[PDB]
Structure 1
């Protein structure tokens, strides 16, 4: 899926979670996250917040790739 909208959406499906739920946990509004999912907000400020809230990686929900913690 790769892109901001697609990859974020995928995980929200995989977790049986709704945007308001994600927004609340992430400390933001639903409309804020919809802007990513709708394909408008290609760089969110609250990106980190969404990531941990949705139990995934910033760079992944963004571009399709997960931070190589393992060197």
Structure 2
């Protein structure tokens, strides 16, 4: 859970959401989530919005603190 992709996947799943629901609520492409969760995108463009949908601190999501 020390990687961003790991952190987002774990939190998404803790909130009982699908990648699709995450995507809808954050207003980004579902292909954007997969890439983040699959560890491709290290620096997400809409991290803020993603974090808002996951009810967590963006800083925490990006850096793990």
When the two structures are superposed, what TM-score results if normalisation uses the length of structure 2? 0.90
Q: Deviations over 1:9-68 (max 9, x none)?
A: 111111100111011110111101111100010001110010001111222222211xxx
Q: How far apart in 1 are the matches of 2:25 and 2:61?
A: 16
Unmatched segments (≥5 aa) in structure 2: none
Q: How far apart in 2 are the matches of 1:59 and 1:10?
A: 16
Please list every run of at least 4 consecutive aligned residues from structure 1 whose deviation after the TM superposition is greater than 4 angstroms.
none
Structure showing greater Rg:
1
Unmatched segments (≥5 aa) in structure 1: 66-71
Q: How far apart in 2 are the matches of 1:36 and 1:60?
A: 15
The alignment yields a C-alpha RMSD, in angstroms, of: 1.0
**CA apart distance, 1:3:** 1.0
In the comparison of the two structures, how many residue pairs are matched? 65
When the two structures are superposed, what TM-score results if normalisation uses the length of structure 1? 0.84
